[PDB]
């Protein structure tokens, strides 16, 4: 089965970490495909500009809700609102991560914990909230992970710990979904370096892997989830 | 080259989740090799019985401290008290896990969180507490993981997630330590099914893998840590 931009046409999609970076690109991509979108992040400010340009790009719905994925109660409640706003859910793109930077690990448990809460725990919380709505549509769950979630790299240990956990968790749930009756697919994205603002600043003179375009990456994620692909790897050509 | 039971002789070792199972087996092995051991777990009474049989087995020191790795403060203070008792640390064997059982995941976020806290966070917290003592001894860290910490399996999703995190974190810290000046080794153990009491009860009649012996396991872990092996795989002869 080939991808067709129409596969997204009209679908009800949720995109977290959408105020910037790859998250925003997907929201615009989803708008250009005429989908319903609910974007979330902390920047109330930036989200509104993203919603508006989403309408201009052709989104069917284009709403936003702001709040921190540090608060599990928000993540839970947000999926309810987003489902109410759209009257259902087809696809849940889990993409937000707490800010991290390249640093040797010394004793920053605080970062290790916050990283695990925002990068891993909240995804499960959002997944638990979205599962019923997703079951009613035979929908899709999209987990945006990193190449550091498959291979441990120095200077990103805590972040790496969180992106592994997603692998362990969502890769098992996928197996349970199989012998259960759950028709919700789970696409895990293993991205290399992507030329987003925050990323490129963070790696500035440390190590160059030839980042790949955030526009093309954002689509390649959307493409995989549409095709119910088990996982997606963006520019392995660069590995 | 080969392991020699003396390599642990006199060494000051910590074993968590040592109140039973593979954790207890490691403490007894360590005493038989005549090392100093400080075991921790929640079971005050059971721990006392383990220290006693360790003295009998020939351990040099053989003490205990009781408490739950749910309280991050305890873990932090535990390594402090444990280092005073032995006057240093040579090897830190992280072995405890929160109770888990075969269950499809539905909405037990509570278990996901407790699993990450006990099976993963406390290990970092303990690792942080011991690094000075371990640097001062060019020591070793042993993280006891599962075949589920490398392959996703149904019914163990929360547990599996926690064991993946251990790999990602310690596998980087190992590489970080490589380019820093840190001579502390990190041994990751990927065990298959091991015939401990709780595991066999928890898997009974559901899963049919060839259980492997806890005595040989507990040793095969220690051998790995003694030789500063990056990781150890126990009875891979049972899976393929
Ligand atoms: N960029 C890469 O090279 C790369 C490589 C591999 C994997 N990835 C993965 O790709 C995803 C995004 O990459 P990126 O370049 O887009 O990062 P990014 O540009 O910094 O985007 C971060 C997003 O996450 C949100 N966010 C941060 N903290 C949040 C919090 N407490 N609560 C809610 N939202 C929060 C941000 O919104 P607010 O600031 O408004 O809170 C922001 O929209 C991530 O899942 C990453 O793991 C990226
Ligand atoms: N058993 C297997 O087949 C298998 C396979 C792969 C990997 N592993 C790993 O091998 C390690 C031990 O395996 P096992 O079968 O021997 O487990 P076990 O027999 O049940 O031993 C559990 C130990 O962990 C401690 N424990 C439980 N909750 C604790 C808590 N909140 N705080 C502190 N300690 C706690 C117990 O002491 P208290 O009850 O007194 O608290 C107990 O001494 C584990 O790290 C496991 O992940 C095991
Ligand atoms: C900001 C944090 C977001 C992020 N997610 N993955 C990465 C990578 C870190 C390094 C270098 C490169 C490939 C791989 C190992 C994954 C990019 N980053 C870095 C940018
Ligand atoms: C009780 C908790 C201890 C534990 N850790 N990993 C396992 C395994 C679960 C299943 C069957 C077998 C191989 C692999 C998949 C890992 C053992 N267990 C047994 C269950």
Short mmCIF file of C-alpha atoms in Angstrom, two decimals, chain A residues 72 103-109 112-113 116-117 120-121 124-125 128 131 135 151-158 160-162 164-169 171-173 175-177 179-180, chain B residues 72 103-109 112-113 116-117 120-121 124-125 128 131 135 151-158 160-162 164-169 171-173 175-177 179-180:
data_model
loop_
_atom_site.label_atom_id
_atom_site.label_comp_id
_atom_site.label_asym_id
_atom_site.label_seq_id
_atom_site.Cartn_x
_atom_site.Cartn_y
_atom_site.Cartn_z
CA UNK A 72 -0.29 14.22 34.48
CA UNK A 103 26.07 17.33 29.13
CA UNK A 104 28.06 14.64 30.81
CA UNK A 105 25.92 13.15 33.56
CA UNK A 106 27.07 13.86 37.09
CA UNK A 107 24.21 13.80 39.61
CA UNK A 108 21.26 15.60 37.96
CA UNK A 109 18.56 13.21 39.15
CA UNK A 112 16.54 12.24 34.93
CA UNK A 113 13.17 12.30 36.69
CA UNK A 116 11.17 10.38 32.47
CA UNK A 117 7.94 12.17 33.46
CA UNK A 120 7.84 8.76 28.89
CA UNK A 121 5.23 8.81 31.68
CA UNK A 124 1.36 6.51 28.66
CA UNK A 125 -1.05 8.85 30.44
CA UNK A 128 -4.56 5.70 28.44
CA UNK A 131 -7.41 4.53 23.97
CA UNK A 135 -10.55 2.04 19.56
CA UNK A 151 21.59 3.27 20.75
CA UNK A 152 23.05 4.77 23.88
CA UNK A 153 25.10 7.91 23.17
CA UNK A 154 27.32 9.88 25.58
CA UNK A 155 26.07 13.19 27.01
CA UNK A 156 22.34 12.33 26.67
CA UNK A 157 22.01 9.56 29.28
CA UNK A 158 18.81 10.71 31.04
CA UNK A 160 18.28 8.37 26.32
CA UNK A 161 16.74 6.57 29.29
CA UNK A 162 13.35 8.09 28.53
CA UNK A 164 14.30 3.65 25.54
CA UNK A 165 11.37 3.33 27.96
CA UNK A 166 8.98 4.32 25.17
CA UNK A 167 10.46 1.48 23.15
CA UNK A 168 10.00 -1.04 25.90
CA UNK A 169 6.54 0.15 26.75
CA UNK A 171 6.57 -2.18 21.78
CA UNK A 172 4.97 -4.53 24.37
CA UNK A 173 1.58 -2.86 24.36
CA UNK A 175 1.97 -7.21 21.32
CA UNK A 176 -0.85 -7.16 23.90
CA UNK A 177 -3.01 -5.27 21.44
CA UNK A 179 -3.76 -10.96 21.28
CA UNK A 180 -6.34 -8.58 22.69
CA UNK B 72 14.66 8.06 47.24
CA UNK B 103 -0.71 -8.80 33.37
CA UNK B 104 -2.02 -7.12 30.28
CA UNK B 105 -1.71 -3.35 30.69
CA UNK B 106 -5.00 -1.52 30.90
CA UNK B 107 -4.77 1.75 32.83
CA UNK B 108 -2.43 1.01 35.74
CA UNK B 109 -0.45 4.19 35.49
CA UNK B 112 4.10 2.28 35.49
CA UNK B 113 5.22 5.03 37.88
CA UNK B 116 10.07 3.43 36.95
CA UNK B 117 10.79 4.69 40.46
CA UNK B 120 14.96 2.61 37.41
CA UNK B 121 15.17 5.90 39.40
CA UNK B 124 20.44 6.19 39.32
CA UNK B 125 20.09 7.62 42.84
CA UNK B 128 25.04 8.73 42.26
CA UNK B 131 30.27 7.15 42.56
CA UNK B 135 35.91 6.12 41.85
CA UNK B 151 13.00 -7.49 23.76
CA UNK B 152 9.41 -6.35 24.16
CA UNK B 153 7.07 -9.00 25.60
CA UNK B 154 3.32 -8.89 26.24
CA UNK B 155 2.05 -8.76 29.84
CA UNK B 156 5.24 -7.12 31.17
CA UNK B 157 4.91 -3.68 29.56
CA UNK B 158 5.44 -1.47 32.62
CA UNK B 160 9.77 -3.94 30.41
CA UNK B 161 9.76 -0.16 30.04
CA UNK B 162 11.70 0.26 33.28
CA UNK B 164 14.83 -0.62 28.88
CA UNK B 165 15.55 2.66 30.66
CA UNK B 166 18.31 0.95 32.65
CA UNK B 167 20.04 -0.03 29.41
CA UNK B 168 19.75 3.39 27.78
CA UNK B 169 20.94 5.23 30.86
CA UNK B 171 24.89 2.29 28.48
CA UNK B 172 25.49 6.04 27.99
CA UNK B 173 26.99 6.61 31.40
CA UNK B 175 30.40 5.70 27.28
CA UNK B 176 30.50 8.99 29.18
CA UNK B 177 32.82 7.36 31.70
CA UNK B 179 35.88 9.70 27.59
CA UNK B 180 35.92 11.18 31.10
#
